[PDB]
Design a protein around this ligand. Structure first.
Ligand SMILES: C[C@H]1CCC[C@@H](O)CCC/C=C/c2cc(O)cc(O)c2C(=O)O1
Ligand SMILES: C[C@H]1CCC[C@@H](O)CCC/C=C/c2cc(O)cc(O)c2C(=O)O1
Lengths: 264, 264
């Protein structure tokens, strides 16, 4: 049985969140698009091994759109880690395993470095460290231009699984549609320079497990692989590209549970 | 003015080879397909910056097909390094900068480790260290079935640039056609276990520059990036996939000259 509800935190944000299961806490942090329905079937699968799985739309996105502007403009890993700690405080989640891709990847690493007593272990996927002009440039476009371009980039290029991406269904793509412009304006200029992965030696020894997409072109996250290896941090592959929890939910969920079990 | 000629080495191989320019020696070793026409426009570009550029079809391939069977069956980095040393002996090339992709990548690092006095510096691209069963399994297919499959894999998937691949023209594709089966039967089962990168500390400090394709899916040469980083070896990207000297000849040739200049 899945809890679907809202909860507020004193930084002005009213989070849509979901939660299933009983056990050690595992938290699934969304990617830049902030849409936690992406995790839907994995939440059930992780929870069915023995875990409490919690997830939530991110601030200004989808059903957590009721939030102040500092919360989705000039976004940084450190700001997002703060937000996620706040919703963990509110849900009384004291010690959490965390997953995150993209801006969520930067969030979970910032979580791990910033709040080490809170984080049992952190799985980051495809941590954006480099400014990409094709993304940054969309921000100056009109909202509806942005949705069209980005919806298409996800559908045809980088879902890692187009049928799975389509099958999320119309409600989700209608929420995504509204999120594309707030993401485009809030994330790509300021998320990469905030990458909390320039201090190699802070990563060393930490309980951190890094993945990249198997089918993702090598240039996108080449740098993650270099950085992990310099720092001794476990690094490997999941199938797909940026959304393995959409395209390969079974392999995704198995990986989250195995990795969490490694750290109980 | 380009020398196009043959020369014979005492291991039974008659090499087709080409050579242009005057300067320090730079040697372009083909990938598994053994076809040196792939380097055509680069040979002129590299040479025009004050190098003597040499290249050749590989044994049992294209115009270097007159060779004994040991030279293109159960092929290995160490065997290939031997073969190229032999043709460098014959052409009286005493010190050489070397490039190689794929089996050529393995060859040039075996060269570097095995004949250090001979190798000024080695650029290796996409060094195959893993057995792939989809490749190994083509070997039992009918020659002509292997050509069709493999011609099509290069054209549609892994060229890194279809137009450029097509533009090489009919003569080269007709030589490739014959090479695909010799390659499939000779290389994929035995080239990877011969990977001369299991001794990390032999690589350390050597004058080696490693690249992978930018557009190449991350899983194919993930392991190169890990291995280079562990060994302090310089590692970066070129555009395209397995054949940057076909798809991006300009950036290929610039990279070979810049990198060679770093080592005079
Ligand atoms: C929203 C996803 C879209 C993936 C598109 C994907 O194809 C582009 C992948 C590289 C960029 C991801 C990205 C980069 C940033 O600077 C900030 C981010 O929040 C992301 C990120 O979350 O990417
Ligand atoms: C000729 C190309 C095949 C291109 C398909 C290419 O996409 C196949 C995947 C990469 C591996 C290539 C490879 C592997 C080996 O064990 C030995 C080899 O000589 C190669 C190699 O030369 O690769």
């Amino acid at each position: 049985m899945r809890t679907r509800s809202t909860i507020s935190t004193p930084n002005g944000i009213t989070w849509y969140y979901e939660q299933e299961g009983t056990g050690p806490d595992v938290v699934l942090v969304p990617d830049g698009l902030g849409e936690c329905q992406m995790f839907d079937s994995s939440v059930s699968q992780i929870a069915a091994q023995g875990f409490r799985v919690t997830t939530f739309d991110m601030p200004g996105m989808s059903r957590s759109a009721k939030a102040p502007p500092e919360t989705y403009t000039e976004v940084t890993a450190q700001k997002l880690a703060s937000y996620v700690i706040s919703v963990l405080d509110a849900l009384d989640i004291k010690h959490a395993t965390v997953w995150g891709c993209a801006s969520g990847a930067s969030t979970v690493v910032a979580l791990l470095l910033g709040y080490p007593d809170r984080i049992r272990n952190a799985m980051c996927h495809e941590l954006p460290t480099k400014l990409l002009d094709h993304l940054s440039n969309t921000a100056v476009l009109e909202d509806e231009e942005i949705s069209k371009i980005l919806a298409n980039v996800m559908l045809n290029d980088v879902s890692g699984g187009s049928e799975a991406w389509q099958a999320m269904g119309d409600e989700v793509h209608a929420r995504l549609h509204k999120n594309y412009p707030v993401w485009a304006r809030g994330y790509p200029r300021t998320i990469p320079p905030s990458a909390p992965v320039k201090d190699l030696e802070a990563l060393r020894g930490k309980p951190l497990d890094w993945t990249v997409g198997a089918a993702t072109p090598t240039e996108s996250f080449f740098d993650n692989i270099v950085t992990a290896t310099k720092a001794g941090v476990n690094i490997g592959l999941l199938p797909g590209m940026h959304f393995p929890y959409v395209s390969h939910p079974d392999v995704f969920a198995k990986y989250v549970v195995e990795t969490t079990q490694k750290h109980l």
